[PDB]
Structure formats: structure tokens, C-alpha cells
């Protein structure tokens, strides 16, 4: 397939920590989704590529009832190393970090894999993680740290029936699981409910380490957020703790042209140095 | 320390029924009481190991039932001409040597193993007090590096006692008589297995016997084969 | 002893104090640490290994020791940080019907690797002969059953021994132990240690609508002012204790010595008496 | 037996303060009354040598 690329508006600003804040402006520095960024338009109308999991991903889904269910996060998707097969079965979610490689292909009955090895975690979460012209958008911010596989989520009932694209509007994500399992994750594999016996299309972005200034409401929720590396107006709204900038000139951060090449010029001399006749002499020095 | 009758000569072969009392328990765990027939000259020969199921040998000595707290080996009706000593083994507790008994004279009358695997010794004639003398029992048949062998010494008049026990490859337990002055060292795993004296204390004058099988935890091992001993004759 | 469990237990509050009242244990010698300090140390996963040995073999279970069972069925290196919990089981594992069920692998080639389970049933081959399966004069059954009987004495009774091997790899610790909880005190300047968040203040009743996932709570400028109770859901408020500045008004040590004390930031009800701005 | 080694104490020690003790420990609020029961021994564990 030729994976399209759609524009991702302001969406994917999750809560970094669990701290109540009322009517403040918090400037956090963490892995977030860059505003007005590109996200592949993989359409599930067949598709199942292996995406790179560099430091965190933002998954989306505009399925109808059960089209997109499950995740096959892992490092190599082999039987040597472990993996993660968090799926969403009938009103339940099974989370196992067992090293089930594969059987034939990630499709689904547990027809995703057929093997048996040693496991490390079986945290079977009982509560599941998941109107004619009323679809349902489900966003999941997957982020991995030294010893926690944090997973964020948010379910919003979108209404507009425009061509398939990310809607316009700020919407934070709430954490649900904090699996403390420690395993390196570098590859991302998705799967759809085949059930053979424009349907849906998942958006998969990429997180980057950036600074974001978030506004907390009086109740305790985030109403909006401003990036600090999108436009000079955003940098001005970040250097001053206020989303309303007055008229004038403000001194923002300094610019510096980063180098491009790198040369290391040492002298010609290319030979060996006496060490076998110095460290190990006839017997030794005195 | 066990209890055995000094001698037994009255009513030869009719009411002898020698045994070994002094246990005051239920023989510990596995009830396996062996009977050794020590004969002057050649090495002793096994007679019976369990309470029943006698090995390939004389069929007129069986029914070694454990009555009370002692195994009464029925010896009546065997024969009327024998000159040897019957020794019984018990007290199978963990790390407990001296399982043999005292000298029981079972001579009914008084007056009137060779080519199985191998039998070799060192021949320690006129042993100098001290030093380090090595005695081997190289066996060209059964493996001398996989089975559980033992070393037992006996002196004129005194009975036998456990002197050295060695497991497969991970145990070098020593007897309580040496208390550390004896160091067992295994030879090449495919040639033989020898011992070491390590500066004896004038009590090692007794004659040695290298047995291919254990005494108290005795297993069938197909057959019980012993070897002749040699006189130390220390000059301390 | 030849096929022992290897239960990998994790993600629980291991309360070892309960084990002191479950069964009348006879040996609780923990070689690694103390049972009092064990309940305050987190771990990743505990390996539970259970077996049954005689009474004279319980002493053989030690961090480094030789014997018929210490180096042939289960060996512990010189790093065991668990316990040697064991107890007699001569109440339900001894019937007069023939106890040909257990074994201890009397025959072996050499010492096994510590913390290893060798589940094998091949005939012991004592060298110098290819034994494709035969029982005579060269190759015997390397397994031998016990002789446990009810009408015996101490030392040769069925003793169940269970060890709990501990490990600390480069993984987040799951099992920590029990968690002591104290009573709640409201409207009183006291100390608090709520889930690592330590401090002092007056725990009062607040009207803040916390989100169902938020636990802590801060203020405009980096100060914790409200936390969520680890017990039944309740929104509290952490205000600092009663503090203030003290000033002394003195007419000088030349006419008199009577002085006045002004406490700043108080309503005369938190220390004649006068209340000013 | 000539080189002794004390055991755990219900309270932390003091710098430059000798810890000579000969009583029996008491876990919780259950006095074992001299005879060593469960979780109550003498803090006089002898160091083993070889
Ligand atoms: C996203 O990437 C594709 C190529 O991968 C590019 O054609 C597209 O223009 C990008 N997004 C924008 C700027 O529309
Ligand atoms: C804040 O919460 C209160 C009580 O639930 C609610 O009445 C009010 O509308 C909320 N305001 C906002 C903007 O969240
Ligand atoms: C703890 O147990 C009590 C029992 O009444 C219950 O009311 C409370 O909600 C529980 N809290 C937690 C943390 O489960």
C-alpha cells in the first residue's frame, strides 16, 4: 500500500503526572506529539505493517464497533525475546508479556499466535479499554520508560461525517494502566478483527521530546496547551506564562546554526608503537 | 557401639540363632542389616543383606527376620564345620561410622571373588612410621570411578569399623578416628583409585580392605566382591 | 526431591508474619536477612521450591554442603538470601500400605549445578559398557524409594522443606511486603507519610473535585496542599502548621522591663490581648 | 564461641555506646519467658569459622 500522510492538529496532550492543578499554567518538558505534524493514513478498508517504536507512539482509531482491537508491541516479535499482546476480547482485556512469537500472521478466537513458552506477567484487566452518523474516536498514547509501560487513552464520540480525518478540538488523555513490566520495545504491530466466516483507518504518530505549556481548568482538567517549537508566537507564549501576549517586542531564545560536517585531522604518522618490547622485556626492568 | 555375644558354641547348628542386640530403636530408616562372614586368610564374603531374598550362595542360611529390636539370622541346620566370625551392621543414621559389631565366635566345631573383577593391593611391608604410603585397588572390570566404594580396616582381635567413605564425585567424608589426619585423593578416572596415609599416628597398623560397595547403605551392585588385605607392620 | 516446584511468585504483598501462625514450623532459620527487616524490603520475584526429606537430612539444606542429598538433588550456593522453612508432616503422609512413591536418586555421575532440576529416568550406566536398557551386574535403577512408616521414631520422618529464593535483577520490584496503616486524625497539626509523600500539616476536609486518576495535588507555586487518602476515597487538604513571626515591643531597658509580644499572622486563637491587622 | 555476634534489636544503637546484652528478644507483645519459642532467641549468635 502507499501509506498516506495526514495532518495532525492539536491532539495527544496527555497528563504527564497525577497532580491536581486549578487555574494555572504548567510548562512541562516530556515526550509529546508535535502540533501540525504528519501522521500516516494507514487505511484498514488489508494492512498490517511493522512500525518503528522509537520513543513513544500515538495510536488512533475511528472504527465502528470492533474493527480495530489489540496491540502486538514488542522488540523483535520472535520467540527469543519477549513481547506484548494486549488484546481486547469480549468485554475483557488480557495483558500478557509472554514470548509468543507468532503462528502465521497477526489476525483474529486466539488465532494471532500458536506457541507456549515462559511468561512474566498475566495482569488480566477485567474492565475493557474500549446514533447513525456518530462514530467513535479512540486515542492511545503509548510511552515506555525505564521500568514502566505507561498507556494513556481517551474515547470521544465524534459527530462530523466529513472525509476521514482527525477532528478539530483539544482533548486530553487519561491513564488507565501502569504496567511495571520491564522489557525493551522497538517494534509496533497492529491487527484488525477479520471475521470473514472505508471501514476504518488507524492513525499512528510519533512522539518527540518537547516543551508544552498546558492550562488547567478550575475543575482539574486541561482545557488547552501550547507548544514551544511550532512558531515564534508559540515561543513567545511559552517564554511568558500567559496565553495572551501584549503588543510589543519580546526577546525569545537565541539561535545558533548547528554544524553539518565533522573533520578530525591528525598527523600522517601511521605505524605501530613499541609495547610488546617494553611491557614484556627479556625478563623485565629493575 | 553395638551388643554382640562374645562366643556361641553350644548346640551346634540347632539353636545357635545368633543376632546383634543393643539397637533400642527401629533400625532408623531403611531396614537393611547385612551379615559379613570374616574368615582368616582370604577376604570376607557377603552372606545376606536384607531380611530376606538371599543372594546367590549357600541356601541353608535364610529367614533373617527382625524380632523385637534385633535381626535374628536363622543359622540352624547349616553345617557342622565352620571357623569364621559373623558381623552385623546397623545404626544407619546420617554420618555415623563404626556400624560393625564386636567379634562373635560362631565356630560350631572349632577344630574342623578371585577372578570376578580384580584384586590388587600395594603390599606395604615394613611401613616406616609416618611418610605417605598409597594403596590402590585397581579393578579392570567394574568402573573404579562411578560406583560407591569404601575402605575398612581391621586389627587382630578388634572388630571392623568404617574408616573411609567416598561418594561418586562430590564427597570426601572421613571417619571419626582420623578426625582430619586422613586425606582421600582420587587417582585418574580411568586407571585406578588410591588412598593416602598422611602421617599416621601409630594406630593405622590394622590391615586395610577396599570394598567396591558400601557397608551400611549397601546396594545389590550385582555381586559383592572383596579383596585380600596386607599387613602394615609399623615400626614406631 | 528430583522434581521440585519452582513457583515464581510476584506482584503481591508478601506478609511473612502470617507464616508464623499457619503451621507449627520447627525450623525458621533465615540465612540472608532478619524476618523483621524482610517485611521492609522490596523484591522482584520469589522462587518457591518445596520438597520432602527425612529428619536427618534437614541439616543438609545449607548454603554450601555435601551429602547424599545436598549435592545430588538440590544444592544452595553461598548467596541464599531466603529461609530454610521446614516442618514435620508425619500426620497425613505415612500409611501402612507400602510407600513406593518417593525417591532420592542414590546414583549419580557428579554433583549437579546448584538451583537445577534434572528430571531424568534413564538407567544409570557405570561406564565400560553400552547399556541400551538392561538390569544386571553393570546398570541398575538410579532411583530408590524411601521407607517411611508411621510406627517409627524421630529422625526418619517425612519433613517438608520449602525455600524462598530471592533475586534482584535490573527490573522494577513487585513484591515488597505488608504495609502498616495508622488511624486518621483531622483538624490537628500532625505528620503524614502518605505513600512516600512525607510532611507535616493540618489534614482538613476540602471541597476539591479531583480526577479519578489523580493522587497528589499541588498549588500555584510548588507546594503540596491536598492528597488523596489511600483508604476509602476522600479529598483532604494539607495546610501548613501554625507558624508565624514574633516581635517584641520594649520601651527600653532604662525606665522599665515590661515588654509586649506581637505574633504576626494570627487571629489570637492559634498561639491583655488585642487583635489588629 | 570466643567471637560473638549480636542480633537484631528493636531500637537503633547509639554511637560510642556498648551493646552488652544477655536477655531474650521478644517479638511483638508475646513474651517467650526465657525459653526460645517462635521469633524469640538470644542475640548471642556465634560466628562460624573454617
Ligand atoms: C507527510 O509526509 C509525506 C511523505 O511521507 C508528504 O508527502 C506530506 O507532504 C507530509 N505532510 C504534509 C506536509 O502534508
Ligand atoms: C466545575 O465543576 C462543577 C461541579 O461539578 C461544575 O458545576 C462546573 O460546571 C465545572 N466547571 C467546569 C468549566 O469544568
Ligand atoms: C478499604 O476497605 C474499606 C472497607 O470498608 C472500604 O470502605 C474502602 O473503600 C477500601 N479502600 C480501598 C483502597 O480499597
Residue numbers in the entry:
A (entry chain A): 24 to 68, 79 to 141, 156 to 177, 181 to 247, 261 to 349
B (entry chain D): 3 to 114, 124 to 247
C (entry chain B): 350 to 620, 641 to 646
D (entry chain C): 449 to 498
Paper quotes:
The epitope of 16L9 mostly overlaps with the RBM, while GW01 binds outside of the RBM. From different states of the Omicron S–FD01 complex, we revealed that two scFvs of the bispecific antibody synergistically bind to two distinct epitopes and induce the RBD-down conformation into 3-RBD-up conformation. Thus, although either 16L9 or GW01 alone could not bind Omicron S tightly, the GW01-16L9 bispecific antibody could bind Omicron S collaboratively with the help of each other.
State 1: up-down-down RBDs, 1 scFv, 3.47 Å. The apo S trimer (state 0) includes one regular up RBD and two down RBDs. In state 1, only one 16L9 binds to the “up” RBD (RBD-1) of the apo S trimers. First, one 16L9 binds to the exposed epitope of “up” RBD-1 in the apo Omicron S trimer as a trigger.
